[PDB]
């Protein structure tokens, strides 16, 4: 994958996922800001959809290392992914749709999808 194909790839996800969801164009802006309000029903849903979309989520809503790294090695170096991977894989959420806005926010404490459009 090229930086390119990842920021059209995250684009189409974003714009699948929004109608998916009905989120609020603003609400889908804030997580793409990385500004995730974790409590937010269609913001989990939204966030929910994204994980999955990627491999990120499983369909057993485990958090998939090698997911999240096919998506991160071309944003962040071996040591942040490693580090993202083993703080994210902490989180522990009964409810998926809370697992998957946790997720995303703690993935944005790393990079933002936002911040891909600026590579």
Do not use: W
């Not at 109608?19 to 989990?44: C, H, L, R, S, Y």
């Not at 990120?56 to 944003?75: R, T, Y």
């Amino acid at each position: 994958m090229t930086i390119e194909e990842l920021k059209t790839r995250l684009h189409t996800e974003q714009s699948v996922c929004k109608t998916e969801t009905g989120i609020d164009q603003q609400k889908a802006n804030d997580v793409i800001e990385g500004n995730i309000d974790v409590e937010d029903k269609k913001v989990q849903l939204y966030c929910e959809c994204i994980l999955k979309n990627f491999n990120i989520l499983d369909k057993n809503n485990v958090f998939k290392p090698q997911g999240i790294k096919a998506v991160m090695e071309l944003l962040i170096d071996e040591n942040s992914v490693k580090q993202l991977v083993s703080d994210c894989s902490t989180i522990s959420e009964e409810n998926p749709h809370l697992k998957a806005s946790k997720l995303v926010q703690c993935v944005s404490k790393y990079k933002t999808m936002k911040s891909v459009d600026f590579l």
